[PDB]
Design an enzyme around this catalytic site. Structure first.
Site: not given
Ligand code: MG
Ligand code: HG
Ligand code: HG
Length: 306
Positions: A16, A106, A108, A126, A158, A210
């Site tokens: 990532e 968290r 990202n 989760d 994202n 994403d």
């Molecule tokens: Mg991503």
């Protein structure tokens, strides 16, 4: 276009956050489950990694400070001092915990806007697809180390990108299966007028958006997780699919332009095998790819200013 597997790099659980540093011709990226940072210097075929003990999701060079990087460590934004080759950082300096009382969140995806401001969002550790906890928010970090919140009710925080004229911001909540567009005020760092730019449902695009990036012509390149592809979409007109590039790995995660001429597209993917996959395990590997012959150039990665 030509898609090549970068053999030297191996397989990643969730590769990532690719970032291309043009001055040093170096690609940095993370594995968001294995708690590792990665460095690849293509011209010299050099690969190194660095281990920490928190979940990580991005790594961006700090402006003006070679050897220092702005990274995420679970919910903390921190500066890591790293020689680029030792398996551990030299030192870690926490800047801010963006959500100190939300224990199961968290950070990202994260990226600097063209002015050097870090933008990043959170999500439940989760978080699930297509449905799961929706606990995330979108922040930016100012040069005064205070965060500002810009959006909430984000499922999976994202990909981010900004238009070449600094009038628009593009943003992906993977849970929404669309790319959103916002008016972006560079002077106040405020976003407004959220509207859908591209909706996967309308174009029979499988999977989830994403990571993303933008090219010199203003087109977006979007990684399609569980779609085995990257797609090129227009920003000039809503709901226009311009092109599709198939990637052998089904779980494409993100994209960054790189190479000497900024015309090579580096693509990360995830080998993590999920419950509800549309792809058999043997197909899900997590390689890093280079795509050439797209006929467009992108921009170098922006460093974070603090
Ligand atoms: Mg991503
Ligand atoms: Hg590292
Ligand atoms: Hg590191």
């Amino acid at each position: 276009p030509v898609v090549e597997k970068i053999a030297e790099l191996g397989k990643y659980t969730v590769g990532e956050g690719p970032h291309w540093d043009h001055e040093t011709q170096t690609l940095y990226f993370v594995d968001t489950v294995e708690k590792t940072f990665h460095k690849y210097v293509p011209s010299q075929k050099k690969y190194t990694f660095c281990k920490v003990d928190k979940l990580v999701s991005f790594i961006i060079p700090l402006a003006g400070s070679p050897g220092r990087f702005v990274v995420s460590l679970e919910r903390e934004i921190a500066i890591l001092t790293w020689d680029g080759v030792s398996a551990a950082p030299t030192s870690i300096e926490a800047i801010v915990n963006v959500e100190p009382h939300i224990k199961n969140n968290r950070l990202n995806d994260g990226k600097a806007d063209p002015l050097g401001n870090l933008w990043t969002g959170t999500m439940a550790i989760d978080a699930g697809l297509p449905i799961g906890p929706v606990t995330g928010s979108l922040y930016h970090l100012g040069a005064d180390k205070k965060v500002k919140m810009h959006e909430s009710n984000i499922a999976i925080a994202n990909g981010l990108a900004w238009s070449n004229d600094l009038k628009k911001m593009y943003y992906i909540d993977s849970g929404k299966r669309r790319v959103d567009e916002y008016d972006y005020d560079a002077s106040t760092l405020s976003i407004s007028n959220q509207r859908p730019l591209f909706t996967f449902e309308k174009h029979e695009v499988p999977g989830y958006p994403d990571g993303q990036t933008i090219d010199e012509e203003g087109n977006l390149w979007v990684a399609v997780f569980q779609g085995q592809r990257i797609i090129k979409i227009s920003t000039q007109q809503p709901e226009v699919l311009l092109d599709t590039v198939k990637i052998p790995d089904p779980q494409v995660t993100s994209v960054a332009f790189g190479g000497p001429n900024l015309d090579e597209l580096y693509v990360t993917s995830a080998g993590l095998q999920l419950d509800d996959s549309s792809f058999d395990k043997s197909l899900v590997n997590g390689h890093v790819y280079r795509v050439t012959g797209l006929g467009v150039k992108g921009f170098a990665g922006v460093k974070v200013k603090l």
